[PDB]
Design a binder for this molecule. Structure first.
Ligand SMILES: NC(=O)c1ccc[n+]([C@@H]2O[C@H](COP(=O)([O-])OP(=O)(O)OC[C@H]3O[C@@H](n4cnc5c(N)ncnc54)[C@H](O)[C@@H]3O)[C@@H](O)[C@H]2O)c1
Ligand SMILES: NC(=O)c1ccc[n+]([C@@H]2O[C@H](COP(=O)([O-])OP(=O)(O)OC[C@H]3O[C@@H](n4cnc5c(N)ncnc54)[C@H](O)[C@@H]3O)[C@@H](O)[C@H]2O)c1
Ligand SMILES: Cc1cn([C@H]2C[C@H](O)[C@@H](COP(=O)(O)OP(=O)(O)O[C@H]3OC[C@@H](O)[C@H](O)[C@H]3O)O2)c(=O)[nH]c1=O
Lengths: 346, 346
């Protein structure tokens, strides 16, 4: 149904996985990646697949003149570009305001001008926090104990705040101006090409570099893990078959606490169970996230394929091990940045 | 009276100027610095009588970080009214709404964080979206979820209401993440003296005084919950001085009416025939019914509205616009010409 799509943020983790998906499975589609190449953008994520199907344009989603030139030639925008890290947002919120809110607005106005399709990629963090399962009457399976499409927005941080704000203007542009938009809110992704500032890759690559893994407080927090490959298929389903104006939740029923994830990484890599450091906990830290993906399953027939987390994590560890040249140049700098605000608890 | 040097942003507009007069007359220990950009909606005449040693007007933008810093360094609280406030202007040109409502709120929040001072965010019932009419509700407007509460989901409809909702979300995230000392109020439709003639009630009153037909959008079945600006002022004062840090309070006076009935009352009170008006082009995405349950504010802080007789409040408002024609006569032609660009008689 689309032949010339713009993928914003396609040189990053999840966005580049999506571009690979289209290159492999839909070779009749042309992709134009629009990416600013911040600290998180990486030409190596796309270099081997650039050609007649995929092109890279370096620039800012808030650059209205550039966005206009690109949108005049496209039939859809799939929007991943964002500042994506909670810890960076606590240290300096400025680029989150610019990219996440002003950038989304700029893209919406182009979609309105050219009357083209727009899919907004977003997060479960817009809904805030939930209690741990041991503290709920239905132990996580009762009404209201997971997020649904009817859950109230209640974000906790400058990152999650600016994401939620962007979701709200998308929805208002549909009602007020008839923009052809859909929204997705997905749980925590993992897999190859994730930046080493994030939880799973940071621990794996610390171990590879002879550095201790780092756990925030005692590791009680719970995240709902989904493989990026499954997020790609979900977005493709919503883009091509979704109902205009609707919000869809994406998740794979994969809740784990941070302590248990770290213990699995240590064991898989041959390290002792206690070979890690407890570090300064995150201001305003969100407790538990959990997604009920019944609407997407029911309506569009999407099913996740990578539901064995043990096997998915094993393949992820092997990828970081086999591609050390992809991350080694960033290790010292990322760890030094964290050292400015985190220390070992003792 | 815990706060002795406050900043009131947007204090040269309708509701903000009414609040500054309330402070001058009722809290003589408070010095007020107004920060106002004087857009088409700002008017020094709304403040002139009380300008002097107790109230200063500083002309500038809430998005100018350098100016905001200089003022915040001398203050012990910020009460934030500055906004682009009109749904119709937001549909014609969303640009100033993005700049003022979102970037402006962000800039003020960063100053409150820097100086560790109290911040009260003034917002609207429109952040919650729309409700059905009472005749179409199983509880006739009296059941759970048939009026807005502090637990109601955000679901804004327009560029105006979505930028306001977005600003509310960052305020709450700055509280959880950084400990900013903020409260939020969400109020229903205000009326009274000093309201800009682009708005519903003053537009009809002044059109009649000028020899022009009033204008009703579609059949006028839409419902708004009217509160006198004087009661909004006492509500904000209560929340500023006694509210629980981080909480939202709703302000309303149980005054729901449809637009047609309000227009008919104006016509009757001004000695005009009941059919002496035009139906005109309806608003894109028009919100149907708004309604506020103000229980939380009444029960926890002891506030009660004093102007509960709408007929009498409207009578006094008509008299004000009649006695102060010099305050608005020069703006009439331009406001009506702007509306003619997008509104025709139907
Ligand atoms: N990572 C997750 O678990 C997760 C889950 C659900 C949703 N999301 C959302 O998915 C999207 C991508 O997340 P990710 O983890 O790949 O992020 P990432 O940090 O790996 O990549 C972000 C990309 O955006 C680019 N970028 C930043 N600012 C830009 C700007 N102004 N103009 C153009 N490009 C810009 C960067 O160069 C980078 O390539 C984001 O919208 C995020 O909120 C992430
Ligand atoms: N009018 C209502 O029924 C209603 C109800 C609830 C809350 N609100 C909110 O109350 C507040 C005041 O509304 P109002 O009806 O008095 O609006 P208004 O249009 O009468 O006044 C807006 C004021 O803000 C100033 N301003 C605009 N942009 C600015 C900027 N960037 N920097 C500094 N000043 C700027 C204008 O000069 C003007 O004096 C708004 O935040 C609005 O969202 C309105
Ligand atoms: C100007 C105008 C309005 N209307 C209708 C539209 C609305 O249903 C109603 C009120 O219109 P507005 O004065 O534009 O107010 P509203 O859109 O309800 O928003 C107001 O209250 C909420 C506040 O947040 C907002 O700032 C304020 O402008 O009357 C008419 O029928 N005829 C008119 O000429």
């Amino acid at each position: 149904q689309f032949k010339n799509i713009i993928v914003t943020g396609g040189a990053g983790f999840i966005g580049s996985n999506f571009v690979h998906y289209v290159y492999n499975n839909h070779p009749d589609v042309h992709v134009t990646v629009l990416d600013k190449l911040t600290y998180a953008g990486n030409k190596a994520n796309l270099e081997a697949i650039l050609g007649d199907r995929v092109e890279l344009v370096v620039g800012d989603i808030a650059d209205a003149e550039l966005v206009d030139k690109l949108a005049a030639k496209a039939d859809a925008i799939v929007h991943y570009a964002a500042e994506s890290h909670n810890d960076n947002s606590l240290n300096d919120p400025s680029p989150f305001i610019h990219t996440n809110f002003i950038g989304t607005y700029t893209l919406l106005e182009a979609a309105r001008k050219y009357d083209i399709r727009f899919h907004h990629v977003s997060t479960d963090e817009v809904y805030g926090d939930l209690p741990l399962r041991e503290d709920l009457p239905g132990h996580g399976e009762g009404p209201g104990e997971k997020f649904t499409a009817e859950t109230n927005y209640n974000p906790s941080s400058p990152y999650s705040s600016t994401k939620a704000a962007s979701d709200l203007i998308v929805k208002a542009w549909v009602r007020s101006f008839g923009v052809k938009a859909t929204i997705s809110n997905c749980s925590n992704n993992y897999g190859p090409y994730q930046h080493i500032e994030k939880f799973i890759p940071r621990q794996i690559t610390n171990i590879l570099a002879g550095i201790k893994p780092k756990l925030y407080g005692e590791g009680k927090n719970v995240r709902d893990w989904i493989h990026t490959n499954d997020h790609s298929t979900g977005v493709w389903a919503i883009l091509t078959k979704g109902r205009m104006g609707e919000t869809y939740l994406i998740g794979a029923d994969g809740e784990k606490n941070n302590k248990e994830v770290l213990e699995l990484i240590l064991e898989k890599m041959g390290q002792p169970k206690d070979a890690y450091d407890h570090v300064t906990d995150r201001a305003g830290h969100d407790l538990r996230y959990a997604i009920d993906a019944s609407k997407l399953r029911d309506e569009l027939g999407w099913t996740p394929q990578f539901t064995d987390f043990s096997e998915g994590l094993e393949e992820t560890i092997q990828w970081y091990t086999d591609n050390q040249d992809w991350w080694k140049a960033e290790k010292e700098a990322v760890e030094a940045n964290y050292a400015k605000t985190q220390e070992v608890i003792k």
